[PDB]
Amino acid sequence: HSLTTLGVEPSFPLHESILKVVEEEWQQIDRQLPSVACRYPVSSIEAARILSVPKVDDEILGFISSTESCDKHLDLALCRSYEAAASALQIAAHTAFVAKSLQADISQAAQIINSDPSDAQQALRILNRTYDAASYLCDAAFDEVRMSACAMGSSTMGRRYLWLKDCKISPASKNKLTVAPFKGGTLFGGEVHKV
Amino acid sequence: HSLTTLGPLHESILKVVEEEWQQIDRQLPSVACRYPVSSIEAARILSVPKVDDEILGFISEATPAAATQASSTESCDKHLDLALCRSYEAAASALQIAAHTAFVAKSLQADISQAAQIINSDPSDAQQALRILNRTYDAASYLCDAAFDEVRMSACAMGSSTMGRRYLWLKDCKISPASKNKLTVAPFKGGTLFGGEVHKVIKKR
Numbered sequence: 381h382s383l384t385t386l387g388v389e390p391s392f393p394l395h396e397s398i399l400k401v402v403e404e405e406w407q408q409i410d411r412q413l414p415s416v417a418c419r420y421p422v423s424s425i426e427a428a429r430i431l432s433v434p435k436v437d438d439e440i441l442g443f444i445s446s447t448e449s450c451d452k453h454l455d456l457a458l459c460r461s462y463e464a465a466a467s468a469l470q471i472a473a474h475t476a477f478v479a480k481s482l483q484a485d486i487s488q489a490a491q492i493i494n495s496d497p498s499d500a501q502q503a504l505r506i507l508n509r510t511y512d513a514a515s516y517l518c519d520a521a522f523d524e525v526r527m528s529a530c531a532m533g534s535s536t537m538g539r540r541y542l543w544l545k546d547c548k549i550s551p552a553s554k555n556k557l558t559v560a561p562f563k564g565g566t567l568f569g570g571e572v573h574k575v
Numbered sequence: 576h577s578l579t580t581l582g583p584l585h586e587s588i589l590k591v592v593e594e595e596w597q598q599i600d601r602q603l604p605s606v607a608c609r610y611p612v613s614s615i616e617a618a619r620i621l622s623v624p625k626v627d628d629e630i631l632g633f634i635s636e637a638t639p640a641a642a643t644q645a646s647s648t649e650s651c652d653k654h655l656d657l658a659l660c661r662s663y664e665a666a667a668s669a670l671q672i673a674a675h676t677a678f679v680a681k682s683l684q685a686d687i688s689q690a691a692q693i694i695n696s697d698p699s700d701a702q703q704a705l706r707i708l709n710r711t712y713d714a715a716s717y718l719c720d721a722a723f724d725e726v727r728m729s730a731c732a733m734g735s736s737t738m739g740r741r742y743l744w745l746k747d748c749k750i751s752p753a754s755k756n757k758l759t760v761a762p763f764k765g766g767t768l769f770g771g772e773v774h775k776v777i778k779k780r
Contacts, residue, residue, distance in 0.1 A: 381695040383688050391613035398674055399616055423585060430592065430765035434737060436744050437767045439777040440758075443749045447648075451743065454655060458739045461662040465732035468669055472725035473588050475676070479719035480584065482683075486712045487578050489690075490705060494576035497698030507691045510711070514684035517718060521677035524669060524725060531666035531732060535659045536624060542655055543626060546648075547637035557630075564620040566627045574633060 383504075383511040387519055401522060402529040406562040409533035413460055414526065416467045420474045427473070431466040433459050450545040457538025464531035468524050475520045482513040536562050543567065576705070578712040591723060592730040596763040599734035603661060606668045606724070610675045621667045623660045651742055658739025665732035669725050676721045683714040737763050744768060750777070 422428050485506050492503040540558045557568055612621065690707040693700050738759075745755045754776045761772035 381688075381692045383691050390611075392611050392675070392678070394612055394614045394617035394620075395674060395677060398670075398677070399620070402620060402670075426589065427585070430589075432766075434740075434763075434766055434768050434770070436740075437769045437773045439773050439779055440744060440748055440769060443777070444744075444747055451746075454743055455740065457659065458662075458736045458743070461659070461666075462733050462736035465662070465666065465669075465729045465736065468666075469592070469726050469729035469733075472669075472722045472729060473585075475725070476588065476719055476722035477584060479715050479722055483712060483715040483719070486708055486715060487576070490578055490708045490712070491576040493694055493698075493701055493704050493708070497694060497701040497704075500694050500698050503694055504691055507687055511684055511687045511691070514680050514687060518677050518680035518684070521673045521680055524673035524676070528666040528670035528673065532663050532670075535663035535666070538659045539624075539656060542652065542659070543634060547634045548639060549637050562624070564622070565624060566630075567624045568627065568630050570627060570630075572629075574630075 383508045385512040385515045387512065387515040389515065397522070398525050401525050402532075403563075405526060405529035406533055406564070408559075409537045409562050410559055413463050413467065413530050416470055416523065416527070419523070420467075420470045420520075422470055423473070427470075431470060433462050433466070447545055450541055453541040454538055457534050457541070460534035461531050461538070464527050464534060468527040468531070471520055471524050471527065475517060475524075478513055478517055478520070482510050482517070485510045485513070533562060536567065539567055578709050580713045580716040587723070588726055591727055592733075595727060595730040596734055596765070599738045599763050600760065601731075601734075603664050603668065603731055604727070606671050606728075609724070610668075610671045610721075612671050612674060621671065623663045623667075651746055654742040655739050658735045658742070661735035662732050662739070665728050665735060669728040669732070672721050672725050672728065676718060676725075679714050679717055679721070683711050683718070686711045686714070734763055737768060741768055 422431060489503045489506040492499050492506070537558065544554045544557060553574065557571060560569055560571060563569055686707055690704045690711070693704040693707065741759045745759060748755065757776060758769050758772055761769065764771040
């Protein structure tokens with residue numbers, strides 16, 4: 381009857397908690413990306429290499445060794461976008477595995493319930509596991525949301541530096557415009573009183 | 576007990592990522608039909624932010640013009656802006672999918688408990704529980720599908736990020752334009768920005 385878990389026990393409106401998650405990440409778009417290493421462990425050396433931010437080949441660096449400040453900021457933005465997306469992928473990968481196990485468990489319980497509705501205790505034990513898996517999936521979905529919000533914030537931060545790189549305004553005004561909170565809609569939000 | 580749904584796990588995930596990476600400079604697939612979202616709020620959030628005319632006008636007026644320089648970064652700049660826009664869009668799409676995933680996950684858990692109560696009370700209602708479980712079975716496959724779509728969107732974002740960085744790092748790289756073109760459009764393989772193609776143009780120490 382009352383199962384239990386250690387976790388959370390033509391229009392599709394956006395959930396209010398999703399909006400809140402996005403808005404809070406966007407209050408400070410230039411921050412470190414949350415690690416997902418402990419909750420969504422990467423399952424292999426291959427995935428591991430493919431998930432890490434790709435390095436600039438030494439071969440290319442050999443042929444290189446005042447927008448340099450811009451160049452570093454743009455690189456950082458792109459690196460964070462990649463990192464936020466890699467994390468979302470790691471989570472999605474975990475979700476796939478869980479969705480699958482949950483599916484196998486449902487069939488199992490169905491098979492028990494069918495073979496004479498009396499082995500309730502067994503089927504109810506299996507359902508208790510599925511219920512937990514469902515809670516986990518809902519939590520994983522909110523983590524995916526958070527990562528997307530971070531990726532969107534980094535993209536935005538990058539475009540802010542890019543669009544201000546050639547105009548002649550004090551570093552103060554440029555910095556103010558670049559770190560300002562983001563609300564979606566427009567790139568700079570709208571510092572009406574720039575001067 | 577015959578459950579059904581109308582339409583190498585790790586291997587499958589790798590395949591999708593690799594397929595998207597064969598052409599990193601490409602338009603993103605739409606999620607509007609499969610993962611529709613509504614509200615003035617989500618519309619503002621999901622669309623790539625645009626530069627406002629008052630800020631754009633201000634930037635322009637503060638942008639000096641003359642002959643001299645001649646080295647207009649315009650090209651590179653457009654490539655970088657496109658990469659960051661695509662990164663935003665790929666992420667926003669993954670967000671729409673995630674939103675649906677939260678909804679389905681929560682619905683699935685309410686159904687599981689409903690089935691639990693049925694078989695907990697008078698087990699005789701086997702067919703009743705089976706119909707509830709048949710629905711949870713579908714929701715679970717939906718979730719697996721959504722997870723693969725999220726993986727796809729993430730791979731696209733990573734591809735776009737990598738494209739942006741290839742243009743950024745080749746900018747002041749003292750190599751010919753033909754070599755730069757080749758490295759930039761090469762398939763992305765992970766590990767390094769140009770790995771898999773780099774050696775075909777520059778040997779290592």
